[PDB]
Design an enzyme around this catalytic site. Structure first.
Site, PDB file in Angstrom:
ATOM      1  N   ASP A  84      -1.106  -1.859  -6.592  1.00 32.64           N
ATOM      2  CA  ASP A  84      -1.698  -0.959  -5.616  1.00 32.64           C
ATOM      3  C   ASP A  84      -1.061   0.406  -5.719  1.00 32.64           C
ATOM      4  O   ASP A  84      -0.179   0.784  -4.913  1.00 32.64           O
ATOM      5  CB  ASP A  84      -1.555  -1.567  -4.221  1.00 32.64           C
ATOM      6  CG  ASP A  84      -2.382  -0.794  -3.206  1.00 32.64           C
ATOM      7  OD1 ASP A  84      -3.201   0.060  -3.564  1.00 32.64           O
ATOM      8  OD2 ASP A  84      -2.125  -1.015  -1.987  1.00 32.64           O
ATOM      9  N   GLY A 175      -3.260   3.884   8.045  1.00 33.99           N
ATOM     10  CA  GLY A 175      -3.063   5.300   8.009  1.00 33.99           C
ATOM     11  C   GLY A 175      -1.712   5.744   7.436  1.00 33.99           C
ATOM     12  O   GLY A 175      -1.564   6.892   7.054  1.00 33.99           O
ATOM     13  N   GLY A 178      -0.305   4.190   1.390  1.00 37.66           N
ATOM     14  CA  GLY A 178      -0.092   5.146   0.330  1.00 37.66           C
ATOM     15  C   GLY A 178       1.170   5.956   0.434  1.00 37.66           C
ATOM     16  O   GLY A 178       1.574   6.595  -0.516  1.00 37.66           O
TER      17      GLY A 178
END
Ligand SMILES: [Ca+2]
Ligand SMILES: [Mg+2]
Length: 223
Positions: A84, A175, A178
């Site tokens: 990922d 949110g 990443g």
């Protein structure tokens, strides 16, 4: 971030906000021209917002730069969340200063129990929804591979680590995806997945960045 605290303004100078009309994910500046984030964050158009503290107010230190290239890991699996990781090339270089700075990639993988700093503008409520203006921070340790693999039987690959707390109350959330996990000056994790956030015996799972330094550097050199 649930159970965190508000970071000091610009104290996380490698943290970026990925914006598609609104904040949707975090990322980390690892070169003047490149941000690393999570592949599950992919969108075909992204504006990178650097030097942010308040993502709802233009405070002066921001640099807004569009993504020119968005490259997901070729072996990303959206079911298992293995690999990922995603790279974003900026349309112009970030200007590096005290408030906009790169973070080092790992020199090695991190020992269990290493202290880390997790940050982002993700959900702050453990029930419902509250999406902060100000960047949130959380201190959390790299968990034992007993604690991580027992929490998610059969689902932790060699490219994942858990960072957090088995008691619940302290985790990254939707949110924050990443965004960074920085331990001893090195980007060791990318906010990736789990089971909700801040639940008992469901610590956050993070992409294990120390496996990806070759892929990152090869992608940078070729693009
Ligand atoms: Ca701002
Ligand atoms: Mg808001």
């Amino acid at each position: 971030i649930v159970g965190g605290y508000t970071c000091a303004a610009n104290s996380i100078p490698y943290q970026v906000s990925l914006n598609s009309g609104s904040h949707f994910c975090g990322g980390s500046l690892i070169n003047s021209q490149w941000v690393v984030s999570a592949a599950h964050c992919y969108k075909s158009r992204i504006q990178v917002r650097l030097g942010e503290h308040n993502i709802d107010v233009l405070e002066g230190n921001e640099q807004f730069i569009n993504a020119a290239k968005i490259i997901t890991h070729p072996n990303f699996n959206g079911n298992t969340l293995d690999n990922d990781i995603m790279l974003i090339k900026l349309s112009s270089p970030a200007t590096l200063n005290s408030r906009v700075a790169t973070v080092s990639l790992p020199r090695s993988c991190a020992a269990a129990g290493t202290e880390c700093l997790i940050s982002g503008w993700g959900n702050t409520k453990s029930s419902g929804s509250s999406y902060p203006s100000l960047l949130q921070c959380l201190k959390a340790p790299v968990l034992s591979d007993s604690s991580c693999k027992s929490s998610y039987p059969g689902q932790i690959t060699g490219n994942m680590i858990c960072v957090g707390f088995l008691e619940g109350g302290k985790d990254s959330c939707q949110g924050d995806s990443g965004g960074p996990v920085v331990c001893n000056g090195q980007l060791q994790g990318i906010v990736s997945w789990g089971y909700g956030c801040a639940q008992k015996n469901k610590p956050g799972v993070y992409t294990k960045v120390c496996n990806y330094v070759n892929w990152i550097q090869q992608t940078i050199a070729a693009n």
